[PDB]
Symmetry: D2
Subunit: 299 residues, 4 copies
């Protein structure tokens, strides 16, 4: 009963670099009839499942270069499109989108597919949300691949983050393909730009895109920080898995400085892979990340 738009299917008819048939779930508890799209590739009896979480303003298409590396190695991959993104349904009311709304959708998806032996792969809000999940499902998660992201700790926001919020407030709507192409350079072509704009025929479809910047916590009393501080405890003290970090250096907000701070709270995190040519959207340079992660790991 949540008012939402479904992106017309013709928007997805030209996706040559992402040739997976999407799967759908529309009975997640609390979200009844809101349909979540997700990629599911590799053998269901694979030992390990790579759960690949996107953020703002992307979808599972972002993971198109990483997915084949994981499936070539004999693993399963699950890459959902968050509500408001990709091929998932898109609520049209501002207030529906929040930290809890997104986090719980992922928790429900995980329990719906009964995912186990999970390698969490995350970036941006993918990590902001996703890194807060294993603490409440410890037996499901075994390893972590982390890219440009952060866990909210409630500290005053850096100028770059504040500027980002004010930008998204002032503009008519965010140019989604524009933003990604500006970040990724030669790693994104016009076919990719088409794919990134595909979910959003107009601004009525971009309420989730509008809401993510507004959701960045400005005080310690936000859900993002409440969950965040518990997660930091989990990765520092409870976590006993293997991790791998890849940093896109051309990121003024969640680049090297923010990632190294994050590394300090992930117990066992080895030396990060630092990709000088990569921006915030690390997965556009993600073949070598997926290869090196796998080589580093004991599968």
């Amino acid at each position: 009963t949540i008012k939402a738009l479904r992106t017309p299917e013709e928007r997805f008819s030209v996706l040559p670099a992402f040739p997976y048939q999407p799967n759908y779930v529309d009975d997640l508890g609390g979200y009844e009839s809101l349909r979540m799209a997700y990629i599911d590739e590799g053998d269901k009896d694979s030992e390990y499942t790579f759960l690949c979480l996107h953020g703002e303003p992307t979808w599972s298409y972002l993971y198109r270069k990483m997915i084949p590396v994981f499936t070539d190695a004999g693993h399963r991959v699950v890459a959902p499109d968050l509500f408001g993104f990709g091929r998932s349904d898109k609520p049209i009311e501002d207030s529906v989108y929040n930290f809890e709304f997104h986090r719980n959708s992922l928790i429900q998806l995980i329990e719906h597919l009964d995912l186990k032996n999970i390698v969490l792969v995350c970036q941006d809000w993918g990590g902001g949300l996703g890194l807060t999940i294993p603490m409440d499902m410890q037996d499901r998660f075994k390893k972590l691949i982390v890219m440009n992201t952060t866990i909210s700790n409630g500290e005053p926001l850096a100028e770059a983050a504040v500027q980002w919020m004010a930008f998204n407030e002032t503009i008519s709507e965010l140019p989604v393909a524009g933003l990604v192409a500006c970040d990724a350079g030669a790693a994104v072509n016009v076919m990719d730009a088409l794919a990134y704009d595909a979910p959003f025929p107009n601004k009525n479809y971009k309420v989730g895109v509008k809401r993510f910047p507004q959701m960045i916590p400005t005080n310690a009393d936000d859900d993002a920080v409440k969950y965040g501080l518990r997660a930091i405890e989990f990765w520092s003290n409870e976590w006993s898995g293997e991790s791998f970090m890849a940093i896109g250096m051309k990121d003024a907000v969640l680049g090297e400085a923010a990632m190294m701070q994050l590394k300090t709270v992930i117990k066992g995190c080895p030396e990060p892979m630092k990709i000088e040519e990569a921006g915030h959207f690390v997965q556009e340079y993600g073949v070598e990340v997926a290869e090196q992660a796998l080589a580093s790991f004991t599968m």
Copy 2:
């Protein structure tokens, strides 16, 4: 003419393009269709740089070049074609064609009574604009030409055919995406905002859709009829100064196309070849405007 006007709020964040736009809505034949244009520098300047955009851009594309020209004491006129920028946008596909666009520019030129014109063009800016001086010879003095072509009715290159099929298969062209993909580090997200600004949705993009369809496949197309006469004009009648800048990272209208063009422009000096620039040469255009001016008398 049935058309949409882009809401003004779309243009409220343009820090790199701080000109107040001018408007004309009584061009002969286009009555009530409002054309937006930049007009900067002293009206009594010796020379006027007439800067013509193509697909899928607007006068914003010239924002780096304009200050170079005005700093040197000249006037600049940079119109937004109908279907683009802040101009009105016809909603019927048949309204857009080679004559529709060419005549709009001819009318604008006569309306402002532009004289001592330095034609600056690229893409359809040139496809159209390079066909104009032959029919108004005394108004044009010099030429700055960037990645463009004059239609000659020859077989289409494979890249151009692929471009047409792309635009016919997709839902709509990702405007900011395309420019950002082409121009790399020369374009930021504020620029992407500007390029997407004219087009709240695909109903505003009928002109953007039509440009690729207009690429001529028949020697009886107006583009080629005008085109062949233009080639004669630049080769035999033109007596002005010219300067060419080539964005090398262009698979359709790059070096090969530009060198062929140079052969038909009498007096055209050695081109400036910008290895880092793509099709949208004006995003690398400060040094083009500087070198053009230094080369010119």
Copy 3:
């Protein structure tokens, strides 16, 4: 012939080019001048990819292409021209000329009795190499061609004249600098080390100095005499398959020069145009090797 041999210690750090070099020091006419060449793949392979470098490179330039060819079951031969790479380096200016280089390659071909050759060339690799098949038509089956030209005697374009004057004004050409400037992110500092490795000082660079001087300024030059015959061969006699890849960021031998070249190669398909590649196309050469092979009927 008086020459210098680059000290072996210069080549001790080449992790991206882990082939043991072969040597030949009794090529007819070049007695005791030792030519280095890579030779990889089964000797009885159907086809041999003969990969010719130009100014101021060596077989290292082909390091990304070689594994693609050998992983498809073919043999690869990549010589270092005299004055370059691991080959011996004549110290007298006059020894280097079009005939000197061309004949060394002809002698190497006969010495190894190479047959079923796929000619891979660029720069002087092509300027020289594209003139060889007309005098050994039975040996050559296919062609992979990148930013190069065949001399026709026409007045030189301004860029080429500027290149000759710049070479003749400077103390010496900065070898690694030039390649790194051209190839961008496709070359790292380990690659720069490899490109500087042949040349401890300018006494080793007489061949490097001579190549720009050899660009023909009169139609009686050997480059043009052989050149015009070659043009006839590719346009009327040649009956093989070809594939052309153009590095677009090349102000001298880019798109315009390569399209002119295409007109004289009978059967040459639509070129692969690489927007991110410069003159040194082989630094972007994985995809060139892959696509060449896919385009070819390798039987």
Copy 4:
């Protein structure tokens, strides 16, 4: 001091750096070792921008910044360190060390009697230069800092250790190659020529070889002794204005290392973060010089 002088013909093609060099060869302690330096702008300018290069560069690195400073009515002094640029080049390994370099700069400063100094530094330029104001407090007014660090004795990051082992294992460092790899499109072949110009062969590169060897691995090192006293100075005694520009494409002294540095510079505003710039920030330095000047009260 046994040294080589780069033959003058090496510098005959420098169209992007058309300043006539000045020389001093009687710096106290340095025998007749001749140091080259650029000195532009009016000699009586209020402020002098002292622009310090590091490994493996010279004053040429500052060619894009110098005109911005001189256009604004200021003086610029940009020395070539001994072993670099047009300066003389000791041929013995042990002559190069932290003290050797630091004292050369102190002597140059006292020789020209430089006064209202804006310290501009990067790499060893900062490693050395940032340790000088604490012993000449009255002569320094402001700071422009780019990808650099002050030695604190803490464990080396893996990338730094790898950098040292690289320089040990190779025949010699490809100087133009390294700079071109870092700066990309901001450097052309004419620039590559300028960067290789000081070094006809490895005999001229002893200072280039020695800088990586000089990186301190633990707290027992002159770099760190000076370093820890400098950190105190910038944190507690410094009262001037500062401006930081970070080249983000730097795996060693990029955003993480620069933000750590910012914490010890009292009054250091938000850094300018240049996504396209590498370690050699000055190759992207026009906008750094412009924004520094706009940020400053002079």
